[PDB]
């Protein structure tokens, strides 16, 4: 029981300094009079930190709780927790020491404003559950405004990982990329993302599809935020709901809400349709009912099932591969993570990408990461 | 040598996984779905944080490397390899796990409202390296606008400490405290705070001295900026350079430069004088030189020379105390950790207070400031 | 639950090297061809192996699981986990890097000469759940042959506790030390040493009791093996059974069996009878019980009820101040532990002694062991 | 200067606890009497030592130091510093908890009535720097006796990467396995495992050379210690000096003494002949001067110079899936670890085999290991 494990470990992070007992000569060395000449040489020259402190291995975890899991807004205080959870998996597949930040600030300007001011301390960030809209201008104004590496899960890091698991899938699939016809559900963080690396990738006609229905320039109803897809997708200018986008679709990727794909429009799909219900903690459509309907491939956020697509196959690597490299994050950087997850396993229906605990894939992502620009 | 050992090393700052392997198991509990409940209890009640997550035994060490030691303002990428020595003092002494954060921001209303929303991260923050007079806003400010509790070094450390060698030297002196004429040479971050503790601990006629003289409200060229100090000091009225002050002075407290107090000036002094030249890293006047001049009593910042007066004495008890107790740091617990630590030894002209190897320091400092207001 | 939370962890003990990510550099020195240099200084004077290893801070906790807690002979296996949570409390309290050795050799004089080819990879020894009568020859042989410091919890260290526990009593029930009737029941690995100490200290009526009633030489049938007690204890001439030597008598020390003492054989003791029912699981008599029967202070082994009495208050100190002043453990600085724990706290009724999480208690037998002889 | 560095650090390594701070529930599930229940359990039954205990991932680095690095028989006191090197090296590339093990007895047959007594405490044995010809004695005794794995690298783990990179040459060299003449140099600890991996492997003229030339049955001159090895080689009944072994031979593989082998001799070996020149810290003969007088392919145990032979690349991986695996260590699991480390790199004359840092390699050999009988 999570509760109990909790209160029992008092946190799931720590530090640990290390040498083992400290005595007038250590001190000398690790402070005054001896750090003194590092500060020298750190204010000399600031990549000197990367030499002489932990810089080169540390990553803030910041979030302002304003998209907690699948919880909500709940806040700073409720998100502590789950952010010393990305912590612990940063140190567990990475070896990364990260430090969990949870702001008490909700205007976008502000949470900008205070990050920048962070750089000194960290070799890079990691945007972690900020809702969106938002979170898409604060990613994008870090990034540039920053030095350090600026990464955020949801959106890139889910991104990241469906590509890889689209490429595996198309390939069993044998269809032409070019030629293919994906729908998907749910244009949010994670939508947004995911539909331009469709795009980049080679993908050529994609359908959005939100709680209004197709998205279309023409019917602005279906425009509700600035959120510019509606002109990059839809070339057969479709229109109508979910059911209609389904029509002759090859692949559907849901990034929504539970239960709201019906069994029977799987039919009407072309041959072999790829189903990614990637909805937590209720998938778009059941797994088992989807290979009944007729899926030829079936793909879940959830554990419990085969195939599962989760950025934990992609934020521990890109991160340590990108603030080694002390570089920032590129598409070219985040496109060989895509083949480098991809490549690392022989595709196949019931495992069109490997599990999390395979570290076989964290170096070959970390590897590609770092090789990249 | 100092800098070879921190590349070796690379960081003086590492975290620690409770469990070894982690397994779907583990990452169940840890992380989500069971995350997903404490989220819900600390964002219901924010002081189960202190319960389920670290929050209990973390602190945050901050600069923004405005007064890195006697550098100056160096900078945050300068300041960072000073403060993981902090946060190195902190886990070694206090067993607290301290997290350096380098502000790459000057401006005091920024700084304060930056450290404002860090608050649902940290148990405690600790204010260090930040150059004076707008240390002392920063702090007030903070103290009172955050709920947990709020330290800088540099002033209150140094106070504590400095008091208590004041109070056994007192004591070895057998003067009356109401009765002693106490100068005070340098009116820095240390002295702003050195004043107000020995006037709270009972003194009535200190001095304070500076670059421009005796501090009088009277001579407006003494007080440079708003601190004030010359409104509850100087009681005789008294004006002119340091040699005036010293003239049948029971005790000099200098925190200013070194080798400016001459050896003659000493014989100036009433009886048995007591001298703290607690500069770095050259003391105001010879340790030697003064017992030859006629000194009972000599203290200096350095362990080159008997009685050391340095933070570490204060700073990991106090802070371990505060956080745990969760509440601000009081007068009165300050206080305590004064009474603590002087009667942490007996007194005696080379030994006036002990070292900061001597652990049961610590925790009679951890003690007082505990069961204190 | 216990055995909930040890399947979790995977263990109690893990391992942590100073450098957090290796490189050429590194290995160059910390093995060939660096670690070359020092190997030769260590074959040179073995003496140095304290300067460039951990044998400064190691500890082996070694058992044969032939007296594993209450449990009897359960074997090393079983033991294991036990040593393993002798190895926390050791990291914990005295920050000793304590590995847990678990021999799978019963005969006595193969343990012996298995531990002794041990010491080059020690800095001390802590003989921990090995039966009696055996325990004593391994523990004295031992000592003698082996350089580093030899220690056994539940023969002196148990003495030790108890020691400081009856000293403190002893001063709230206001009898004089030398006109005591102390009745110890139970004469094994701490029974034995209770005795000893009782005796040191100055108690001179003592009454030994166990399977046979009063241990008295004219009674051969009480004389089991050659441990010597009655020849030393019983003035009186005393002879039965337990109820028989609670008579008159002022003090009850129990390290038996639990339910064995009957709550009216208790007013058949002197005034204000103190009642340290140590066995574990189950005392003597029920805490509850004899508080009602008439106890004037009550003693045990759990953690349950209040005073509690165990070894923890006691081994991380002794061991540590030992093990640094590189010397055997003797009688005075066991002495000096009974004195140190005793006066670490204001004795009353309810707490004549401090809990083992009283850190100050672990500093002052640290303190007092360290400047014993 | 390794020497200032060990004296800086005061062990290389450290143990932890995972919890932070000991609280009266702490005990009461790692102690007493929570403990107990495990206690229990565990002695119920062996193996539920690897689910309550960190014995799934301890080993023991034994050694008695009789054949420390290239230093001798220095003693225990010697090879301390050197244990704790292999033992850093366990943490750092498998992750596992080594514990450094010197033992202050010399007489083989107690080492092995020792080290069977340890099998209570450990998941695996690592038996290091034990000189020959009793190593070879006390490693076969023991893996047959003990039931957790038993490998000693000097000999196994040599053999593993010496084939590994044989293995890869012989691709480059195209040649055929069953019809190349293998000349090996010093018949000793490694020597001897080589000699017969070889043969296991499909080699057939295997030549091994020693102090007294060619070993052949007939000249008992060459037959030093009962160490056989002139039984199962030598086919073509070939006799003499080195320099007479190396007539038409194809690979020479040298594990004996610097600068033996003369440049010239180069010349009358076979076409494209290999050069394993392993010995340290003076290879057999020079890598450059091998270049040189016309080696194809040449290999040394140093650093300083391309494809380096080292059993790094073996001994992470192979004890981490063997103690996990809870078998002994048999020719299967050795053979996938060569062809392991083999296919884990292309091969090319100036790259082999890959370098110790390579992570992929210990995730491919602690893989084959694994999966292996
Ligand atoms: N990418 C991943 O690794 C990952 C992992 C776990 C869960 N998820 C899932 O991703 C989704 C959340 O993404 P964000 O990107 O985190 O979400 P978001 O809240 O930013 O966007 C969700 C989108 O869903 C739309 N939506 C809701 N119901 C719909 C419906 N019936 N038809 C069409 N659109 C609908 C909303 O209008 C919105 O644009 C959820 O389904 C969540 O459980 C993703
Ligand atoms: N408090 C401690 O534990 C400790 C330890 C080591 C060194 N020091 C010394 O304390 C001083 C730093 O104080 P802060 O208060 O930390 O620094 P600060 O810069 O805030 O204040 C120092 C004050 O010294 C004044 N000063 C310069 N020359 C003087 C003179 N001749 N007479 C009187 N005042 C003069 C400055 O104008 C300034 O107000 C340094 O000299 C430093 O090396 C203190
Ligand atoms: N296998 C590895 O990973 C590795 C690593 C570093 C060094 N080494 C080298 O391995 C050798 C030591 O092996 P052990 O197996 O550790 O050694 P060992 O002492 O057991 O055997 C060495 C053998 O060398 C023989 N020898 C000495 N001079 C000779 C000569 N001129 N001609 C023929 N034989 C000669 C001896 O008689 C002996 O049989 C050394 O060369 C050592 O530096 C091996
Ligand atoms: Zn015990």
Redesign the interface.
């Known amino acids: 029981?999570?509760?109990e494990?909790?209160?029992?470990?008092?946190?799931?992070?720590?530090?640990?300094?290390?040498?083992?007992?400290?005595?007038?000569?250590?001190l000398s060395?690790?402070?005054?009079?001896?750090?003194?000449?590092?500060?020298?040489?750190?204010?000399?020259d600031?990549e000197?930190?990367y030499?002489?402190?932990?810089?080169?291995?540390?990553v803030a975890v910041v979030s302002d709780?304003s998209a907690?899991?699948?919880?909500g807004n709940?806040?700073?205080?409720?998100?502590?927790?789950?952010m010393?959870?990305?912590?612990?998996?940063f140190?567990?597949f990475a070896?990364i020491?990260?430090?969990?930040?949870?702001?008490?600030?909700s205007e976008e300007e502000?949470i900008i404003?205070?990050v920048?001011?962070?750089?000194?301390?960290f070799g890079g960030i990691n945007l972690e559950d900020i809702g969106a809209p938002k979170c898409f201008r604060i990613l994008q104004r870090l990034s540039e405004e920053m030095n350090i590496p600026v990464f955020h899960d949801d959106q890139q890091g889910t991104a990241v990982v469906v590509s890889a698991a689209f490429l595996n899938a198309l390939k069993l699939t044998e269809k032409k990329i070019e030629e293919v016809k994906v729908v998907v559900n749910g244009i949010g963080a994670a939508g947004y993302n995911i539909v331009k690396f469709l795009l980049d990738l080679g993908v050529k006609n994609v359908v959005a599809v939100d709680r209004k229905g197709i998205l279309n320039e023409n019917d602005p109803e279906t425009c509700l935020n600035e959120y510019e897809i509606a002109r990059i997708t839809n070339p057969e200018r479709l229109s109508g709901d979910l059911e209609t986008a389904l029509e002759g679709a090859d692949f559907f990727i849901g990034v929504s809400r539970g239960n709201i794909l019906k069994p029977e429009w799987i039919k009407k799909m072309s041959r072999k349709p790829v189903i990614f219900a990637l909805a937590?903690?209720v998938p778009e459509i059941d797994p088992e009912l989807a290979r009944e309907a007729g899926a030829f491939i079936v793909a879940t956020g959830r554990?419990d099932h085969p195939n599962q697509v989760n950025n934990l196959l992609a934020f521990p690597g890109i991160m340590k591969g990108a603030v080694e490299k002390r570089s920032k994050i590129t598409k070219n950087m985040l496109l060989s993570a895509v083949e480098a997850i991809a490549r690392s396993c022989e595709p196949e229906p019931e495992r069109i990408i490997p599990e999390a605990?395979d570290?076989?894939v964290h170096?070959n992502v970390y590897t590609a990461v770092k090789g990249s620009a």
Do not use: Q
């Open positions: 029981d999570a509760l494990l909790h209160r029992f470990l008092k946190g799931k992070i720590r530090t640990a300094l290390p040498v083992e007992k400290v005595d007038r000569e250590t060395l690790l402070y005054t009079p001896g750090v003194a000449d590092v500060a020298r040489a750190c204010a000399e600031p000197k930190t030499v002489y402190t932990s810089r080169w291995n540390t709780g907690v899991l699948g919880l709940i806040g700073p205080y409720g998100a502590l927790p789950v010393e959870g990305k912590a612990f998996l140190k567990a070896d020491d990260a430090f969990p930040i949870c702001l008490s600030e502000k404003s205070i920048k001011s962070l750089e000194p301390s937590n903690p554990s605990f570290m076989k170096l």
